[PDB]
Amino acid sequence: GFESPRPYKLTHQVVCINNINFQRKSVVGFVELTIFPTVANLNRIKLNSKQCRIYRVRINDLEAAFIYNDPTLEVCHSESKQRNLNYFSNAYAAAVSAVDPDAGNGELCIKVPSELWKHVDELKVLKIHINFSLDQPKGGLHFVVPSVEGSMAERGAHVFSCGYQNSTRFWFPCVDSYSELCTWKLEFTVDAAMVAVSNGDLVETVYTHDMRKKTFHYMLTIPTAASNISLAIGPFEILVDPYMHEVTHFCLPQLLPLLKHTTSYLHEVFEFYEEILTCRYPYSCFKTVFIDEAYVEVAAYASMSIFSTNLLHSAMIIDETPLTRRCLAQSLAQQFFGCFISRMSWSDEWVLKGISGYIYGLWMKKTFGVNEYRHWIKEELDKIVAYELKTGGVLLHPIFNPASHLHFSIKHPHTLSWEYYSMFQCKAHLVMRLIENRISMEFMLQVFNKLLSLASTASSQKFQSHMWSQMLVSTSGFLKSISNVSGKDIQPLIKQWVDQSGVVKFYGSFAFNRKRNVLELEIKQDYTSPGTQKYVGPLKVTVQELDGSFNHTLQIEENSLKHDIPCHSKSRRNKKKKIPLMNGEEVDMDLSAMDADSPLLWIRIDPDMSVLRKVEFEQADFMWQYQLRYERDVVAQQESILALEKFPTPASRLALTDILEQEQCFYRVRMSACFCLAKIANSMVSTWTGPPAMKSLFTRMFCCKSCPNIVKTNNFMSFQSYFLQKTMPVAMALLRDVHNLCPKEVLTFILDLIKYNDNRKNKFSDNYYRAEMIDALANSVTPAVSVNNEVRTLDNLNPDVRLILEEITRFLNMEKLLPSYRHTITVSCLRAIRVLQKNGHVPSDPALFKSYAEYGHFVDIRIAALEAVVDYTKVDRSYEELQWLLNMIQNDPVPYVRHKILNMLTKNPPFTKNMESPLCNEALVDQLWKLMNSGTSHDWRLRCGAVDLYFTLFGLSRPSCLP
């Protein structure tokens, strides 16, 4: 049951936009809302509006009086001397709650005229006509106007609606909540050479009487919220999908072949999401818009998605196909379960984010294989356990503070830190995988189909929300639908992993009792760490003995420590028979390293990742080597690679080398075995016999049979030896000698890989392989032996580093004349120049990176150069570079770059709270408090980034370096 927090119900909204002026960055328009009051004596009506100048408001064609105030413009007063962050977080939460449409509130308060009170008490319709104007919007809707001359279509100027969550208040007045569903009528009067893309279906396109402008009329009969309404106006090249004909793809001019190749996969994503769920795609059209200077890499609205143009690749670009493919896939998953089925509160957001991430993981499983699915699930689980042990924990479904261990309030999406938002979505889809583990996948897809079917029977009624609230899901409704389809309720699993905000830590060690033939496990939990919680459920453990692989369920109550499980025979060591594996197959194992008295080959605690856990198991090194070689699970091979770094014995070198030589191993395991072999090789110097690690293996796999030092000409058509070939010198360059100087045998090998590179014969580009070669050249740089702080000149230039510097100069200059993809070689060469500057080789001068961080460059070059400037101002304690970065945060045209500068200055801070630095003035405290209070008031993501930066630099209490 859904009861509105608003005293009115909104039925229909007309959004008309005229006069989109690109020179002056200005729109004019009106908005006409059709509300039905649910309570008599409605009097004031409270709507949401930011940055719009409200000209006049007429209610039922009668002139009404409005008052506007935004408490989130300046959160605390300018003349308050408070400088602690808990004060700002409480004031910011109160300010966002005072404009919240999820309460009854709002920023624009319109007073109903007196003569309509007899029209409002007996509950009859009210039609509110506001007309407004955006004069020059800061972060409302982004105007990308290039400075080439010509007409606005000839120079490539466009507008798009940017922002996250409820940010539609930034460009027209609305009820900007996800729970106020209404039908829509959208008119946009644009230039005749431009096209206006929006939500709904385009019913017509009429000309103006001078035929210089045309009006696009859109209609949206599926009741969506105001927060799902978008807009993209530009000189877009239109491409109808040749497979599905209601899907149109819009790109920027001159990028039509890239659009043709890139969006050619999307019909398979549509077919997948419509056959695992049994509902068809709910909207009547689908539109993909590719734009410049995007807010996020992929945004999903109702019947529309806005991607950045940096996803567009051609047919000869690999290492970008899978990333763009999965961006399209998660946009479509959010089309199904973020835009059609919406949220009922700010709680129950974990339901929608979990269903979106879970069905996108099912797509990844079918498309890229179960092994890529397991690797992705393991990397997300490692991400969450790192974040939750780092700071507190992520609390899905809080109850309204519920989480007081962090520095922000979790009551609203616009007060969350961006890393918390990312980890929120990550934990939501892993908890949905856990619900699939308890209640099987076909029942899970039946739950999702029942939600979609209730929403689509709701979506066709005309009753103003008598039935339109069946399109809003809640937690209680989701659990009730689960209990309807399965008969089991998941309330212990919901109580543990949703309502409780923690992950578990397992420390395991075993001992084999030879007398009674048992395996005595010893599993203890660390439940006193700040991020942890105590697990009391069951726990699966998989033991591989000589007779095969056996699963055991252990009951781990609070007082439990020793778990005795039984062991089988050892009669497959009496005769040589094959040892049967986890799957149905069996292999020949070399049992010379195994103990004579124990049959068990390896043990895995929680193999299926059925809890949110971090396992620290103490096996013997031969058990880790057997688990690396003969396991049929990629997460166990990865964890054995990760645990073999502590055992540098030559049997582990043989194990990793046999993994590296082995095709029919998953390629991301071999790419990890490269770096593990490099670390082991660095640890057993003065024992290593022959050549450096992986060199003979590289010449055996990727070089000519007649010439060992000449590499084969590039043929990248295998896509697994391409990735292994481009990752093996990067790990080979980490080879550390006894003198701590990289062997001139590996550096010469990398330089010969660079010289003899011929790419005139493959059908794929070479930009990522050459960029990884520059990364391998940067990995070989050891710190220089400066004497008496000698000024770095050409007289003291290392003879090794002169070759590296010549190569990166040649590569960067050739990129200036012939570029590649993603400007990968510019990014790699800027990263390598920063590596050479971090050691004492090149003079520590930020002027090159400051010239590459200007506005007109590509955004990857910009963020690489700004990462170099952030690293410089951390190491050299530069005041003027920090003022340069803070000025660039305040006034840069691209807001993604501002968010990225705040993000990088949070990750690599110039000082922490423990450090005494010269940069801890009262002036810097006043600048960052002014940046939290004012200055970042227009983005909701810069303000949370400024809160994160103030927390990283000065902590939760009063800045110490202050009177």
């Binding site: 890239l258 590649s820 993603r822 460059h857 590509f858």
Partner: peptide
């Protein structure tokens, strides 16, 4: 300037066009 000269880093207008686009196809 004689030894190791670097071409100076020049600002463009649309950097994604010179980054992402392939030149030999």
């Amino acid at each position: 300037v004689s030894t190791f000269p670097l071409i100076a880093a020049r600002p463009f207008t649309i950097p994604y066009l010179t980054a992402l686009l392939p030149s030999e196809l």
